[PDB]
Amino acid sequence: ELVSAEGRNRKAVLCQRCGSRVLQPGTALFSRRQLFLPSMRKKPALSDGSNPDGDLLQEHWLVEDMFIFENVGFTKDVGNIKFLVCADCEIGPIGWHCLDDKNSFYVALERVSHE
Numbered sequence: 001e002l003v004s005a006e007g008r009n010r011k012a013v014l015c016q017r018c019g020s021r022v023l024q025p026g027t028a029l030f031s032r033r034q035l036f037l038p039s040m041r042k043k044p045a046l047s048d049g050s051n052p053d054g055d056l057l058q059e060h061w062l063v064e065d066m067f068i069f070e071n072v073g074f075t076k077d078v079g080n081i082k083f084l085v086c087a088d089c090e091i092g093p094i095g096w097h098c099l100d101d102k103n104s105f106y107v108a109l110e111r112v113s114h115e
């Protein structure tokens, strides 16, 4: 129940990774599209934690302009999807940005804070 009657984030999205201000409350459309966010951390780690699968989410604040964000970054296409990573903590993939829609910006709901 985060999207009020209209399909717009009623709360403000805050990079829960750096308590940064991602999007404002009312500047992002809703998007329950099954998206996939592969932990950009990757890195070596050696052995890993047996969990190379990103997160197949579905809710996403679909914005029509990345300029709306603030200190947000963008994870180059990791194979077939341009993910998004807050520039204050390049990690994500917190947002989803496929190449099919150069204007379909996504902000993984559960992958962000909301107050």
Ligand SMILES: [Zn+2]
Binding pocket: 015, 016, 017, 018, 019, 020, 086, 087, 088, 089
């Ligand atoms: Zn951040």
